[model samples]
Target: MAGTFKIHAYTEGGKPLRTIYLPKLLKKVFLDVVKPNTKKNLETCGILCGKLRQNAFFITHLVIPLQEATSDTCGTTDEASLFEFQDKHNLLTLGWIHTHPTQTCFMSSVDLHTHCSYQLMLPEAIAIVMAPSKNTSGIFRLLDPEGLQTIVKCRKPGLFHPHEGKVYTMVAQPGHVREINSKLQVVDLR
Candidate 1:
């Protein structure tokens, strides 16, 4: 927190995801990796694959798999690719990021449901939305204890009622983001 790279992240709803470490190079890596989908205004989706060092988190990898995308949604292929990528690179699924090619940034109700699943695997798991059309985006996480609890207690699936809990918040160890430019390896396991 004192010396880690800072990245400004938020949810579509404007809730702060936290002070993340998204290096300048990694932004390019993410852009290049999802370029194809972005070019077509098709939804682009992938994993925020990375590793942790003591109290620091380094997103050293970017991965996009074979998948299907409609204008508003993306469904990644459930190939062994995801598992293989994590194993091959010795990485963890830190979080997820997707693009809304034609729209602005913000999370839908279903997005919360999705984030909940990922958080179940890792409390720090986050979600990022890159909306190139509007030149805006967000990086988000379920708000701490309350947000996590509400989503986990939910049992419905698909589209459902919005949970009336404090859903997300911008979080940081002691303050806001600090920038660090670094490159990450990009691998497509699709």
Candidate 2:
């Protein structure tokens, strides 16, 4: 254990991240995507927006932005609409969520790149991947130091290229996030 480090969820500054409380009802967001997108084997993605209070963040909004997605990938197209809505409501960008209709609950190479932007902007930003076929879901974040360091300078082209180190890890266990019974607003622009 001298050189090797434990791969637990942590922040870039070596402190535990502030807790993020998501509504248990967030499962509905996945259900909403199934018929329209997942049933057809397409991907759907959404943004997690909320407010900060007393050193914690509560996810109150789920913004489903306009995007184009294939089986293994999804990208947000109208960032203006997303930002506008957040501005209108004074919401802070907490992270994002997406579906993997066919694959399991793990971040692909493309996902690591996309999540890098969010995590860089906000240290506590998270990525929630829902895989219905595999009957699994995962809340993840880019690993500090090892994951962030390598990916930040990586200039490799293409969405699914290999990374030299572990770029992400599950955060649901022993991390600062919780699922509680609360209100969740779904803003669909698709």
Candidate 3:
């Protein structure tokens, strides 16, 4: 089943985006680094950054920015610092990852909206949700045509809301993403 998911993403120039490579250890290290917060039922979020190389995006950095988080909500603070770090090292914002301590792996309504901007910046951007309670994780992105369009037209307020149809889809088999056994650099700014 894992190898059955599929998606097609393209760059803003109408060219198909190259595959994105993610380090296999990133998710595990993030989970481990946020163990205390997870145990406390707080959400922990991190930024996925890397560089474009060999026509592909290779995620090499997992940046944990200073943020305010509660049991079910997390948002980064000190944006200046994050941008500075990225600029200093020439990193691109590939995607985002967050833990759902008490729930299963899925993007909440707010999560969908939040990721819209990332997708807008780069079509290949993805979102990773980690659910320790369920011992599961998921890699996802908004569907190119419908999913992406739905959220952009949605102007509803608040965190929890409903949207018609599937607003996102898991990056399935023959996916544009790969978990490579490469080095992962973690930047914790909290």
Candidate 4:
């Protein structure tokens, strides 16, 4: 749900903008308290994790729940527990994260629909999909709901060198996908 990481945002013309560095202690607490519970529930219930960010522009945390129980679909009592956790932590609902076990690192039709609906409510929020593969970990950013279908990727995948104190910036454009800048680095979790 919540993980502390530094964020640097620039203008479209590459002008130096803003950089925010979250404290390491907060990061550790977020990962330990929030992410593990979400990941565990998703794996246990065979569903996805949904998150809600405290800060709109920046994600402060997440909200992961099991599938709701209904006569029409497979549901569980995860929502109540999720709300309890949120209330206990004093976290504002931002967006969500889900898993696509053994699947490609892409959003399916249903996933898109769910994302669009969530985007309608929280336009600036993010949706993360996790694919637990040996060498495949997918991280995505959804900015505009209107451009969700057209926008294939926002950035490319590169190594995160936490030890070196660098964050690589990869470029992702239509028909052009590759790591363009390896100089910029950030703390790596993996």
Candidate 5:
């Protein structure tokens, strides 16, 4: 967050001034990661980028994080290009994304561990999931208090549930997903 810049304002009182947005360009890029790599069950771990604009937060760019992944989980190890991608593109880390090729859209315990770090960094940060096989995807953010607390307090590995998904707020729902028609340069890493 050292060199990151904002358009309007960032999180206030543990919440966004308005709903966070997932641009169609970004959504398409995330989903694109799944198809080209469909032969293998490995998931794509893409680092998301964008800025805060007035009352809304917009996701506009993507950088594939260097990580090892499976059908359900992904872990970033080498950040070689992750940081460089932002510096080169002049973007900041908004959140992170992963795919669920064969599974449903939900956060496993470890996923919360992975995503919570972002939540604590910027309250508007998010975790995006795309399940190409299921033709489903979702964008999620910590539920301000409880959700952030639950993940921060968690000490589980793999897919242990965080109990109620009520801890988080899902931005993507049938007929609610929107299009922003914006574009950003992406760094290709996996």
Candidate 6:
């Protein structure tokens, strides 16, 4: 049950930038994708960007659900609505994006394991971990296939700087995942 998902970045001058099209879906079956292992925390979710073709990509119109994590609830049930919504809209499950409160933009060990397991089942999909801090943000891509582990850096041009941070886009292929680790470093993780 592997499918493809596309990540499209917003471009300047009202044009779409790059597209990272993935050939699989990474399942964020639990609420862990949004909130951390804490209680009474805020949660947010969004789409992972990629290319549709060579130099073009489109952002998904999928609306991710955001909620508050409680002691008895983790956020998995609330996040499942996104899965159903994607199915209804005919959008394949691309990976997911979540935020870390008061933390730098780095993936934790738990995040890595979650990404690895998801990519293992869906080798064509890419996992994105977003860590937003007070002064900076960190985004990482887990591109592992056939027992190979590759970390991608997502860099994007400054089109709309909603906040003081950097953006990077990736191109999702049928069986391959490219790692553009930094804005200036682009490599193939096949």
TM-scores of the models, in the given order?
Answer: 0.77, 0.90, 0.91, 0.41, 0.76, 0.43
Deviating ranges (above 4 Å) for candidate 2 = 1-9
Q: Which residue pairs in candidate 3 collide?
A: 5-172, 5-173
Weakest 10 consecutive residues of candidate 6 by summed lDDT: 181-190
- Per-residue lDDT tens digits of candidate 5, residues 91-125? 76778878877778876667777888897887667
* Per-residue accuracy of model 1 over 68-147 as CA lDDT, tens digit each: 77777776767587887688768888777888887888776667777887877866577878788788767766775677
Error of 6 at 23 (Å): 19
Error of 3 at 36 (Å): 0.9
lDDT by residue (7-87, candidate 4, tens digit) is: 444333343332221222322233343344334443211212223334212334333355642211222355566667656
Q: Write the per-residue lDDT of candidate 3 for residues 1-190, one digit (tens) a residue.
A: 7745455755324558668999989999999999999999999899999999888899999999999888877888788999999999999999999999989899998789989999988889999999999999999888776788999999998878999997788886566898789998899998
Q: After superposition, how far is residue 2 of candidate 5 from its true place, in Å?
A: 40
lDDT for residue 48 in candidate 6, whole number 0-100: 48
The reply for model 4, stretches above 4 Å from the true place, is 1-63, 68-89, 141-145, 148-190
Per-residue accuracy of model 2 over 78-121 as CA lDDT, tens digit each = 89987888898899999999998889889998899899889888
Model 5 residue 153 distance off true place after TM-score fit, in angstroms: 1.5
Which scores greater on lDDT, model 2 or model 6? 2
Best by lDDT: 3
- Residue-pair clashes per candidate, as listed? 5, 0, 2, 19, 0, 19
Q: Candidate 6 residues 43-87, lDDT tens each?
A: 344544333445433333323454444322212335466556555
Off by over 4 Å in 6: 1-43, 47-57, 66-75, 78-80, 121-124, 146-190
Ranking by lDDT: 3, 2, 1, 5, 6, 4
lDDT values for all models: 0.70, 0.84, 0.89, 0.36, 0.68, 0.39
